[PDB]
Amino acid sequence: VTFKYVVKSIAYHKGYYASFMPKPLFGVNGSGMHSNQSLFKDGKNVFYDPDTPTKLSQDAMYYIGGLLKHIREFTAVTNPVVNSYKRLVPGYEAPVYISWSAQNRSSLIRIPATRGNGTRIELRCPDPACNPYLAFALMLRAGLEGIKNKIDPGEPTNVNIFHLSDKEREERGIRSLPADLKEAIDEMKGSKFVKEALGEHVFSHYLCAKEMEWDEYKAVVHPWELSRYLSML
Amino acid sequence: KCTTKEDVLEAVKERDVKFIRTQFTDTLGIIKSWAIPAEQLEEAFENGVMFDGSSIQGFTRIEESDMKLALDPSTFRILPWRPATGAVARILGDVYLPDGNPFKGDPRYVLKTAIKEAEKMGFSMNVGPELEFFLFKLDANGNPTTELTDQGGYFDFAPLDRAQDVRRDIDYALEHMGFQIEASHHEVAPSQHEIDFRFGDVLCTADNVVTFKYVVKSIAYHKGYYASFMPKPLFGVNGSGMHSNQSLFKDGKNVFYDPDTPTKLSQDAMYYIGGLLKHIREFTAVTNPVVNSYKRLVPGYEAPVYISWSAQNRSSLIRIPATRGNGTRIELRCPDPACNPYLAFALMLRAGLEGIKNKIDPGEPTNVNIFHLSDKEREERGIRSLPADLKEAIDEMKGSKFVKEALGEHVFSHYLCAKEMEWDEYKAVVHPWELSRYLSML
Amino acid sequence: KCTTKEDVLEAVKERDVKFIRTQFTDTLGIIKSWAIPAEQLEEAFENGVMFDGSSIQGFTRIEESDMKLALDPSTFRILPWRPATGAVARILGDVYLPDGNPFKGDPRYVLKTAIKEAEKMGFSMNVGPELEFFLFKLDANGNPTTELTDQGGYFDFAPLDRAQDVRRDIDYALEHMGFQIEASHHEVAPSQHEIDFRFGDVLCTADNVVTFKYVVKSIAYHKGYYASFMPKPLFGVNGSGMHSNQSLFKDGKNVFYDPDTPTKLSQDAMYYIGGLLKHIREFTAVTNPVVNSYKRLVPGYEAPVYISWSAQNRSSLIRIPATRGNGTRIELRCPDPACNPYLAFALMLRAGLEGIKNKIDPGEPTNVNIFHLSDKEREERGIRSLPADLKEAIDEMKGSKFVKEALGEHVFSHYLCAKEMEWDEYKAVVHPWELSRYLSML
């Protein structure tokens, strides 16, 4: 929170603007907030195991399984605005598919090669418009849920998911992140995990406000529509 | 001199250095960097720095991309500007894969293997590069343009307005970073300049060509100007080369010198010229790396479009200057300042080494003007020309076993796939010149 | 119909024709003309007209330049506009040298020797060409632009503003000049159009291709618009081809039709295709004659960039329409409207005749999407590409025994020297695309 207004005020006072929009510009990369995370117990990194082939602990995989299980249900929180889903389209750094991996840098969940006390899990989908208190708490709960209930993450996806067919990925059982805000809202409104994690007051307020933001945006007639249709129809 | 990491940490404390920048290149030559706070540096010396290797090798494939940079203290160099915030330095190092093996895809690594190959035969290689560039104006938004800062010519005393101070400030910045410039001059084209590096060890010299580019650009930007390293920004005037003087040394003596020959050149120098000529066609895509490179490699200017060697003729592809003794050198004239110097010098070193190994005679010199000749004359002489555009240079490299083994397969294929993409984009473009020639005609 | 000079002179008096314009082309396809006052016309029939033959072969060489044109009264045609002064007509002729032999540098004469070669084997050639153009706006000074007149697409009923009336007036002018159009339609690109002509003898049809282009351009100018035959005036939208539909005839019957074969195509229609495939790469310089022609011959649009034939695939370099009986035709899709139609049609004929005579098998058809394949698969299928730029077309034709003999040495060597000059000029131009991509980067 401090960072955003500090960076903005510094830039304004030098004559520039610092923008944290997900997708300010079509056809170039958007801005994400990749969120690397470690869990610690008795002073030691819960995710590290020197004796497994990949040197990841079992709780690391359970933590990943929990994130994979619930992420669709709080994309509405990590990707909060209409513009967020112009970043979550294929073609750029943004991860639009639900999977984990160590090898593929573009998987939704990534494991960097670092081991030891610095073993970490990178969750790549969030963008800087999200409330970080709500995002980090939901990631933490989801990971905790995975560990308590021993949620297997399945197999890693080591290939390019974009370069697969719609059936190829359904053969793999690979799901998508919600395609727009309305879709993220509908996934979250029906989630007991999200509702209990946020509490009812936050859950309901957040959803009513975002539902109003979408109901405003969906009626706008954009200049792209005039360019495509005015001569045509 | 910086020798140990304690040398660098003391200098950081003593000279109030607050930021350290890394300095490296990608496969295609673009200069890469990330900034390190001085507070993070002692940890950086201890454990190396993790970073994304897509910075060097790109995104187009699924390949290992967690890399580790180990900082070389002896490359610590303070940049020649002093923000109120405090001083800034650059540093280089070696890139490793998570298993602990060196990453073969870093161009500087590619150069280091070439240096090892010559040392296996006794030699180490010096280079003194001659960097040409234009100084242009900025538009109202501080955007680069090709607008001239003078109408001067070859060795003129020009410019003589506010741009005279910018040019002097560029020379000053590099010299007092420790480049040890030999001489700078106005070059043939309007607004065109050249700075002559010191003849030095090839590895450290390649580090310097990268530093030179962003130091010059940043100095000029902050004075209201633009420094351009495009091979050919302007039709109808000289393009900008990076001629590359080079020699080999053994036991501290210059092996290109032989006092007891008429030319006072050893035979190994002739075998080295012979190797360079045998392979130059196959890596023109590395020395001349962009589509614009081949607007400079056309007849009529300083650019050599014909494969030949000469002592006398300044036109040759390879020229041997008059200097003898310890400064005996071979000048290769075709490279332009967009190349990746790590790869360009490495391939030069490997081509010449292959000549000395296989005793490749260079043939006779060519003391005539080759542009004045007819095709049958050049054909009779066996005077072949360089690739005429990037695509031809891509096709030549792709077939070359010599370039592949010298670069390594990862670099070899990555380089060709990216140049093949740039050419396919360019070749489809309908250019204004076509509308002028044909719109009213057809 | 006019056949004698008495017919034409009778028609000139009756219709009040005051101007008689000759109509020919130079080696490179450019339309050429001089105006004869209808008072001079009776002497022109009696004695011919002396003119400088550099109008055809250019000034490059010291060669005979005092040519005589003899008017063919059967080629007399009144133009579809009526100045206050009286009517205008075009007329063609046969060009002779002072010794009395035909000038062999006249492209129309090259078509006649190709026609002569076919009649020797008992055949004649019919062609119905499909001509594409853009209809663009003029600027305030009346000069051409690439500004659109509509944003319609394939077979759209567009334009519906005043450009609708201009399009109708173009079709009406050609129809009432005796062209007998089959149909016209909006083509894929915005502002792009096509006109399908009726099948006629190749000589009659080539004459009409030349008339068509200046008739259309003039009618458009006089309504305030511009008709463009550039191969690719705009990036990212379709280019314009001149699809060339052809059949041979003998004894009153279509040589390509065979009722008894499974596909109803005769064996000599297959040999004609095989000889076209064998040689098409050798005269893409003729069918695709300017630098811009190779901005249309890139993958992504209607244009065919691979060498193959097919009946099922609409896109192949050679396609066979479903039509049978006397309307059985072959359709070669690579030419564009910049090509000199006399030369394009002449080589098309010679290649097919050579296929028939030498029994040249065309191989199996390619019914798949070639652009969807990978270069490995295309190699496995023996699928070569067309030359990718004017220069590679120059080098293919420069080595062709078939093209040199079909055209004659004069036309062959003038064409190549002129095109090589065009390429050497273009290959040096530094284009704004290059500044956009490189200026800030290097």
PDB file of C-alpha atoms in Angstrom, chain B residues 27-176:
ATOM      1  CA  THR B  27      21.803 -13.365 -28.225  1.00  0.00           C
ATOM      2  CA  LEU B  28      20.983 -10.642 -30.770  1.00  0.00           C
ATOM      3  CA  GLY B  29      23.170  -7.930 -29.212  1.00  0.00           C
ATOM      4  CA  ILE B  30      20.666  -5.827 -27.226  1.00  0.00           C
ATOM      5  CA  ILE B  31      22.276  -4.505 -24.034  1.00  0.00           C
ATOM      6  CA  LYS B  32      20.685  -5.869 -20.825  1.00  0.00           C
ATOM      7  CA  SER B  33      20.765  -4.735 -17.209  1.00  0.00           C
ATOM      8  CA  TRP B  34      19.133  -4.819 -13.824  1.00  0.00           C
ATOM      9  CA  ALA B  35      19.811  -2.514 -10.881  1.00  0.00           C
ATOM     10  CA  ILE B  36      21.109  -3.663  -7.496  1.00  0.00           C
ATOM     11  CA  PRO B  37      21.017  -1.420  -4.390  1.00  0.00           C
ATOM     12  CA  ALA B  38      24.445  -1.089  -2.802  1.00  0.00           C
ATOM     13  CA  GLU B  39      22.937  -2.524   0.385  1.00  0.00           C
ATOM     14  CA  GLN B  40      22.310  -5.857  -1.405  1.00  0.00           C
ATOM     15  CA  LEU B  41      25.817  -6.182  -2.874  1.00  0.00           C
ATOM     16  CA  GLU B  42      27.688  -8.133  -0.177  1.00  0.00           C
ATOM     17  CA  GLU B  43      24.947 -10.765  -0.254  1.00  0.00           C
ATOM     18  CA  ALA B  44      25.250 -10.681  -4.061  1.00  0.00           C
ATOM     19  CA  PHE B  45      28.986 -11.460  -3.901  1.00  0.00           C
ATOM     20  CA  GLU B  46      28.321 -14.287  -1.419  1.00  0.00           C
ATOM     21  CA  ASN B  47      25.503 -16.198  -3.160  1.00  0.00           C
ATOM     22  CA  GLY B  48      25.328 -14.837  -6.701  1.00  0.00           C
ATOM     23  CA  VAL B  49      22.163 -13.260  -8.068  1.00  0.00           C
ATOM     24  CA  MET B  50      19.209 -15.201  -9.477  1.00  0.00           C
ATOM     25  CA  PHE B  51      17.549 -13.690 -12.551  1.00  0.00           C
ATOM     26  CA  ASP B  52      15.403 -14.722 -15.516  1.00  0.00           C
ATOM     27  CA  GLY B  53      17.453 -16.144 -18.408  1.00  0.00           C
ATOM     28  CA  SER B  54      14.781 -15.190 -20.900  1.00  0.00           C
ATOM     29  CA  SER B  55      16.666 -11.873 -20.798  1.00  0.00           C
ATOM     30  CA  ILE B  56      19.471 -13.491 -22.821  1.00  0.00           C
ATOM     31  CA  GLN B  57      17.754 -16.308 -24.708  1.00  0.00           C
ATOM     32  CA  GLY B  58      14.215 -14.991 -25.140  1.00  0.00           C
ATOM     33  CA  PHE B  59      10.782 -16.439 -24.460  1.00  0.00           C
ATOM     34  CA  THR B  60      10.067 -18.468 -27.610  1.00  0.00           C
ATOM     35  CA  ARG B  61      10.895 -21.923 -26.140  1.00  0.00           C
ATOM     36  CA  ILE B  62      10.327 -23.842 -22.932  1.00  0.00           C
ATOM     37  CA  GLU B  63      13.902 -24.082 -21.639  1.00  0.00           C
ATOM     38  CA  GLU B  64      15.570 -23.653 -18.250  1.00  0.00           C
ATOM     39  CA  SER B  65      15.332 -19.990 -17.310  1.00  0.00           C
ATOM     40  CA  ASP B  66      16.420 -19.738 -13.647  1.00  0.00           C
ATOM     41  CA  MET B  67      19.993 -18.477 -13.940  1.00  0.00           C
ATOM     42  CA  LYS B  68      22.628 -17.380 -11.462  1.00  0.00           C
ATOM     43  CA  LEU B  69      25.019 -14.474 -12.051  1.00  0.00           C
ATOM     44  CA  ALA B  70      28.297 -14.675 -10.124  1.00  0.00           C
ATOM     45  CA  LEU B  71      29.770 -11.168  -9.842  1.00  0.00           C
ATOM     46  CA  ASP B  72      33.296 -10.583 -11.134  1.00  0.00           C
ATOM     47  CA  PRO B  73      34.783  -7.881  -8.846  1.00  0.00           C
ATOM     48  CA  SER B  74      37.486  -6.985 -11.342  1.00  0.00           C
ATOM     49  CA  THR B  75      34.774  -5.690 -13.743  1.00  0.00           C
ATOM     50  CA  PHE B  76      33.426  -3.173 -11.215  1.00  0.00           C
ATOM     51  CA  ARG B  77      33.448   0.222 -12.889  1.00  0.00           C
ATOM     52  CA  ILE B  78      31.843   3.459 -11.713  1.00  0.00           C
ATOM     53  CA  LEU B  79      29.688   5.194 -14.304  1.00  0.00           C
ATOM     54  CA  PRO B  80      30.585   8.808 -15.246  1.00  0.00           C
ATOM     55  CA  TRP B  81      27.548  10.608 -13.827  1.00  0.00           C
ATOM     56  CA  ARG B  82      26.853  11.611 -10.232  1.00  0.00           C
ATOM     57  CA  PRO B  83      23.189  11.763  -9.233  1.00  0.00           C
ATOM     58  CA  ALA B  84      22.468  13.683  -6.056  1.00  0.00           C
ATOM     59  CA  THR B  85      21.221  10.327  -4.776  1.00  0.00           C
ATOM     60  CA  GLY B  86      24.824   9.008  -5.042  1.00  0.00           C
ATOM     61  CA  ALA B  87      27.157   7.217  -7.420  1.00  0.00           C
ATOM     62  CA  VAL B  88      26.341   4.388  -9.867  1.00  0.00           C
ATOM     63  CA  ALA B  89      28.537   1.510 -11.045  1.00  0.00           C
ATOM     64  CA  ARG B  90      28.311  -1.331 -13.533  1.00  0.00           C
ATOM     65  CA  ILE B  91      29.514  -4.886 -12.979  1.00  0.00           C
ATOM     66  CA  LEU B  92      29.665  -8.058 -15.103  1.00  0.00           C
ATOM     67  CA  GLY B  93      29.954 -11.755 -14.285  1.00  0.00           C
ATOM     68  CA  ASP B  94      29.407 -15.375 -15.279  1.00  0.00           C
ATOM     69  CA  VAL B  95      25.994 -17.033 -15.805  1.00  0.00           C
ATOM     70  CA  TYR B  96      25.350 -20.549 -14.469  1.00  0.00           C
ATOM     71  CA  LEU B  97      22.583 -23.117 -14.750  1.00  0.00           C
ATOM     72  CA  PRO B  98      20.938 -24.345 -11.515  1.00  0.00           C
ATOM     73  CA  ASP B  99      23.087 -27.510 -11.669  1.00  0.00           C
ATOM     74  CA  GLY B 100      26.247 -25.393 -11.442  1.00  0.00           C
ATOM     75  CA  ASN B 101      27.365 -25.657 -15.039  1.00  0.00           C
ATOM     76  CA  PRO B 102      28.028 -22.469 -17.024  1.00  0.00           C
ATOM     77  CA  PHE B 103      25.233 -21.311 -19.287  1.00  0.00           C
ATOM     78  CA  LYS B 104      26.520 -21.799 -22.846  1.00  0.00           C
ATOM     79  CA  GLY B 105      23.960 -19.333 -24.282  1.00  0.00           C
ATOM     80  CA  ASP B 106      25.559 -16.175 -22.885  1.00  0.00           C
ATOM     81  CA  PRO B 107      27.485 -14.526 -25.753  1.00  0.00           C
ATOM     82  CA  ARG B 108      30.282 -13.520 -23.350  1.00  0.00           C
ATOM     83  CA  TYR B 109      30.638 -17.224 -22.547  1.00  0.00           C
ATOM     84  CA  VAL B 110      30.868 -17.916 -26.285  1.00  0.00           C
ATOM     85  CA  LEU B 111      33.757 -15.424 -26.465  1.00  0.00           C
ATOM     86  CA  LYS B 112      35.459 -17.029 -23.458  1.00  0.00           C
ATOM     87  CA  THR B 113      35.489 -20.433 -25.225  1.00  0.00           C
ATOM     88  CA  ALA B 114      37.159 -18.866 -28.284  1.00  0.00           C
ATOM     89  CA  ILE B 115      39.787 -17.300 -26.009  1.00  0.00           C
ATOM     90  CA  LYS B 116      40.391 -20.769 -24.537  1.00  0.00           C
ATOM     91  CA  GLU B 117      40.797 -22.256 -28.026  1.00  0.00           C
ATOM     92  CA  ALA B 118      43.568 -19.812 -28.964  1.00  0.00           C
ATOM     93  CA  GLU B 119      45.293 -20.268 -25.593  1.00  0.00           C
ATOM     94  CA  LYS B 120      45.363 -24.013 -26.359  1.00  0.00           C
ATOM     95  CA  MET B 121      47.585 -22.992 -29.304  1.00  0.00           C
ATOM     96  CA  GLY B 122      49.610 -20.343 -27.365  1.00  0.00           C
ATOM     97  CA  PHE B 123      47.864 -17.136 -28.525  1.00  0.00           C
ATOM     98  CA  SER B 124      45.812 -14.401 -26.917  1.00  0.00           C
ATOM     99  CA  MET B 125      43.923 -11.831 -28.967  1.00  0.00           C
ATOM    100  CA  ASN B 126      43.967  -8.020 -28.839  1.00  0.00           C
ATOM    101  CA  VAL B 127      41.301  -5.843 -30.416  1.00  0.00           C
ATOM    102  CA  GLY B 128      41.116  -2.126 -31.014  1.00  0.00           C
ATOM    103  CA  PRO B 129      37.703  -1.184 -32.354  1.00  0.00           C
ATOM    104  CA  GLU B 130      36.834   2.029 -34.178  1.00  0.00           C
ATOM    105  CA  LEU B 131      33.255   3.012 -33.385  1.00  0.00           C
ATOM    106  CA  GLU B 132      31.319   5.251 -35.748  1.00  0.00           C
ATOM    107  CA  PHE B 133      28.050   6.939 -34.798  1.00  0.00           C
ATOM    108  CA  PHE B 134      25.903   9.935 -35.625  1.00  0.00           C
ATOM    109  CA  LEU B 135      24.915  12.712 -33.266  1.00  0.00           C
ATOM    110  CA  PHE B 136      21.354  13.815 -34.037  1.00  0.00           C
ATOM    111  CA  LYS B 137      18.854  16.259 -32.580  1.00  0.00           C
ATOM    112  CA  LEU B 138      15.821  15.439 -30.435  1.00  0.00           C
ATOM    113  CA  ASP B 139      12.372  16.620 -31.453  1.00  0.00           C
ATOM    114  CA  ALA B 140      10.102  18.692 -29.187  1.00  0.00           C
ATOM    115  CA  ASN B 141       9.096  15.625 -27.169  1.00  0.00           C
ATOM    116  CA  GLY B 142      12.704  14.537 -26.660  1.00  0.00           C
ATOM    117  CA  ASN B 143      12.250  11.794 -29.260  1.00  0.00           C
ATOM    118  CA  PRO B 144      15.149  10.661 -31.449  1.00  0.00           C
ATOM    119  CA  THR B 145      15.279  12.054 -34.985  1.00  0.00           C
ATOM    120  CA  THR B 146      17.747  11.905 -37.861  1.00  0.00           C
ATOM    121  CA  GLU B 147      18.038  15.705 -37.904  1.00  0.00           C
ATOM    122  CA  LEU B 148      21.604  16.889 -38.348  1.00  0.00           C
ATOM    123  CA  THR B 149      23.788  18.722 -35.830  1.00  0.00           C
ATOM    124  CA  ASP B 150      26.307  19.861 -38.454  1.00  0.00           C
ATOM    125  CA  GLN B 151      26.991  19.661 -42.171  1.00  0.00           C
ATOM    126  CA  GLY B 152      30.606  18.681 -41.588  1.00  0.00           C
ATOM    127  CA  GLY B 153      32.826  16.205 -43.389  1.00  0.00           C
ATOM    128  CA  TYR B 154      35.891  13.990 -43.003  1.00  0.00           C
ATOM    129  CA  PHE B 155      38.125  15.146 -40.120  1.00  0.00           C
ATOM    130  CA  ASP B 156      36.517  18.587 -40.130  1.00  0.00           C
ATOM    131  CA  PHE B 157      36.589  20.658 -36.973  1.00  0.00           C
ATOM    132  CA  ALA B 158      32.821  20.378 -36.536  1.00  0.00           C
ATOM    133  CA  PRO B 159      30.425  21.066 -34.853  1.00  0.00           C
ATOM    134  CA  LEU B 160      31.241  24.517 -33.454  1.00  0.00           C
ATOM    135  CA  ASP B 161      27.933  25.319 -31.634  1.00  0.00           C
ATOM    136  CA  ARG B 162      26.403  23.823 -28.456  1.00  0.00           C
ATOM    137  CA  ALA B 163      27.062  20.366 -30.009  1.00  0.00           C
ATOM    138  CA  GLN B 164      30.821  20.984 -29.750  1.00  0.00           C
ATOM    139  CA  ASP B 165      30.423  20.751 -25.973  1.00  0.00           C
ATOM    140  CA  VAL B 166      28.370  17.569 -26.094  1.00  0.00           C
ATOM    141  CA  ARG B 167      31.040  15.889 -28.268  1.00  0.00           C
ATOM    142  CA  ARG B 168      33.802  16.950 -25.898  1.00  0.00           C
ATOM    143  CA  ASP B 169      31.711  15.745 -22.932  1.00  0.00           C
ATOM    144  CA  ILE B 170      31.336  12.309 -24.584  1.00  0.00           C
ATOM    145  CA  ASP B 171      35.123  11.998 -25.011  1.00  0.00           C
ATOM    146  CA  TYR B 172      35.614  13.171 -21.431  1.00  0.00           C
ATOM    147  CA  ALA B 173      33.093  10.718 -19.960  1.00  0.00           C
ATOM    148  CA  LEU B 174      34.729   7.642 -21.527  1.00  0.00           C
ATOM    149  CA  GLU B 175      38.328   8.684 -20.900  1.00  0.00           C
ATOM    150  CA  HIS B 176      37.714   9.380 -17.237  1.00  0.00           C
TER     151      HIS B 176
END
